[PDB]
Design a protein around this motif. Structure first.
Motif, mmCIF file in Angstrom:
data_model
loop_
_atom_site.group_PDB
_atom_site.id
_atom_site.type_symbol
_atom_site.label_atom_id
_atom_site.label_comp_id
_atom_site.label_asym_id
_atom_site.label_seq_id
_atom_site.Cartn_x
_atom_site.Cartn_y
_atom_site.Cartn_z
ATOM 1 N N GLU A 1 -10.888 16.508 -6.924
ATOM 2 C CA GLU A 1 -10.475 17.704 -6.884
ATOM 3 C C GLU A 1 -9.228 17.747 -6.564
ATOM 4 O OE1 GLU A 1 -13.271 21.344 -6.069
ATOM 5 O OE2 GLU A 1 -11.460 22.814 -5.992
ATOM 6 N N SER A 2 -9.277 17.738 -5.525
ATOM 7 C CA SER A 2 -7.940 17.994 -5.027
ATOM 8 C C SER A 2 -7.001 16.701 -5.883
ATOM 9 C CB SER A 2 -7.489 17.275 -3.586
ATOM 10 O OG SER A 2 -8.428 17.806 -2.588
ATOM 11 N N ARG A 3 -7.232 15.792 -6.242
ATOM 12 C CA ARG A 3 -6.060 15.195 -6.866
ATOM 13 C C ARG A 3 -6.439 15.776 -8.057
ATOM 14 N NH1 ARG A 3 -8.822 11.406 -5.014
ATOM 15 N NH2 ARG A 3 -10.633 10.863 -6.686
ATOM 16 N N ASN A 4 -6.507 16.398 -8.797
ATOM 17 C CA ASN A 4 -6.465 16.888 -9.634
ATOM 18 C C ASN A 4 -5.602 18.614 -9.547
ATOM 19 O OD1 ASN A 4 -8.686 15.763 -11.262
ATOM 20 N ND2 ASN A 4 -10.065 17.131 -11.545
ATOM 21 N N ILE A 5 -6.132 18.620 -8.225
ATOM 22 C CA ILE A 5 -4.895 20.066 -8.238
ATOM 23 C C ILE A 5 -3.350 19.861 -7.306
ATOM 24 C CG2 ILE A 5 -4.681 21.870 -5.600
ATOM 25 C CD1 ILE A 5 -7.372 21.896 -6.628
ATOM 26 N N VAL A 6 -3.314 18.243 -7.039
ATOM 27 C CA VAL A 6 -1.308 18.719 -7.374
ATOM 28 C C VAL A 6 -0.900 17.604 -8.059
ATOM 29 C CG1 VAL A 6 -2.151 17.928 -3.940
ATOM 30 C CG2 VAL A 6 -2.403 16.450 -5.870
#
Length: 287
Positions: A52-57
């Protein structure tokens, strides 16, 4: 064994990527950059996984580093590694070899030495008066086996330059290439001098483009085909906590002749939809 691990939170994991992007990315400064970064940090506060973090950044990576930058998950990185191929040649006639030089992303010493070794053997132990080097559809990967295998036909000198966001200009030379690892000898560098035709198409990208640049300005060399994909920037790659990779753009590029590239396509000397045909004819005239 006796192991202590306290992995970062999903938020931390995301913030680590933003720090790197800001630290080295070509474009990661200024009013638009924060805002994008601030917006990214706000979402990261409630992120529930690394994925999810990779999607967010993603927006931040794409903005801060440009179109040559990205985050590859561990799984994506491995599937890409499994797409790797080895060089091939076919004799066109008694004087001309056609060498196919494909994408390889592998890191392991054995694979990359098999790739470069195959090239070395062709160039050093076969008989020819001219070469066709085909970089069509080569979208990059590991520079080391590509440049390394072609060592015998490249200068023991500057290959290309690159400059970072802080204005530090550096140079990739044949010495910066870990030939020792490929068990290839520096005494073989630049020992073959024949007319060389290089073919590129729209998919030719990245490492393949920088391999293409390494031949630019050589007087025995000429290129045919179409403009390349336009991923002429240097990346640095950062291994993240869970095996994901941040590929981050950190360098603008220039060739030996002084021409500048920044994710801009390379024009072959002779644009054409029949580069094998025009290649051979050109090679004939020079033989």
């Amino acid at each position: 064994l006796n192991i202590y691990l306290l992995p970062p939170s999903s938020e931390r994991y995301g913030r680590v990527i933003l720090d790197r992007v800001e630290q080295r990315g070509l474009y990661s400064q200024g009013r638009q950059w924060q805002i994008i970064r601030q917006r990214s940090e706000k979402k990261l506060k409630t992120s529930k996984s690394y994925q999810e973090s990779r999607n967010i950044v993603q927006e931040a990576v794409r903005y801060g580093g440009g179109k040559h930058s990205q985050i590859l998950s561990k799984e994506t990185v491995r599937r890409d590694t499994l797409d790797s191929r080895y060089p091939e040649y076919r004799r066109l006639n008694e004087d001309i070899l056609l060498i196919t030089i494909p994408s390889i992303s592998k890191l392991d010493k054995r694979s990359i030495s098999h790739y470069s070794g195959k090239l070395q053997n062709i160039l050093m132990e076969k008989s020819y008066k001219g070469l066709i080097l085909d970089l069509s559809n080569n979208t990059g990967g590991n520079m080391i086996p590509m440049i390394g295998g072609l060592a015998s036909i490249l200068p023991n000198d500057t290959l290309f330059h690159y400059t970072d966001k802080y204005g530090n200009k550096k140079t990739i030379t044949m010495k910066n290439i870990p030939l020792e690892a490929l068990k290839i000898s520096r005494k073989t560098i630049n020992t073959k001098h024949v007319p060389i035709a290089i073919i590129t198409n729209h998919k030719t990208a990245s490492s393949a483009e920088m391999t293409f640049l390494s031949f630019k300005g050589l007087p025995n060399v000429k290129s045919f085909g179409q403009a390349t994909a336009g991923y002429t920037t240097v990346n640095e790659t950062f291994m993240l906590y869970d095996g994901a990779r941040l590929a981050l753009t950190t360098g603008i590029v220039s060739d030996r002749q002084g021409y500048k590239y920044e994710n801009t396509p390379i024009l072959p000397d002779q644009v054409t939809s029949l580069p094998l045909q025009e290649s051979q004819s050109w090679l004939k005239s020079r033989i």
